[PDB]
Amino acid sequence: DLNWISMRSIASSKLWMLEFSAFLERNKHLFVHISQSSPSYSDPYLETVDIRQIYDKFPEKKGGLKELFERGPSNAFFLVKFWADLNTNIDDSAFYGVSSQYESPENMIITCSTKVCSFGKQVVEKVETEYARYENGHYLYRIHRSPLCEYMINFIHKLKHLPEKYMMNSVLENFTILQVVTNRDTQETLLCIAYVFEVSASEHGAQHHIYRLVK
């Protein structure tokens, strides 16, 4: 029952996302990035999306998004649309990384699962686990510079080599990532974020829109 924060940002009752970035450096370039600041009560309610609208873009049945939503608490579930910034020449040898940070009032051990889905079928999943560090008066979870699956490096190289932005978007329309952060002991879904992608129409710069999943 700590809802006010979760109506206004990417957070459940027990975990709040500080940062998420995927990047490439030899120096640095952000493909996608989210950064939340401290929630104010006066911040707007996030827009809501009915979850049944995205089920066919993630795995279904046993290990699936629908099942997950039915179980872990419903205020844990979010949808992020990214407009990715693929305009970098650093790729033409370098490090590809994803970094994220979460805060909580509880001291837990968490696992973060990120799963690549192609046409709703799951392809690859990286699972990281992180212990808590106390700071100010909360617990901080910091998953720093984890390398990106070779699947994604290859995908990004080919995505970038397409001649027309409509083709990029056709490739991206059936490409999704599902992030699930779980408490390792009680295995209670702390956060679940469904990612969907387009390429940014700017020549440089990445954008995002954050929705809260419902019903």
Binding site: V124, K126, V127, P147, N154, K158, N174
Partner: protein, 35 residues
Amino acid sequence: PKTEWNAGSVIFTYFEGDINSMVDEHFSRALRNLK
């Protein structure tokens, strides 16, 4: 699913081929007679 430990994390692979082929299967399906 194939399982691999690397640099502190566990990676599950859900397909039997080579990765390059996996990426291509997605691209070729997405771009097959697109408008």
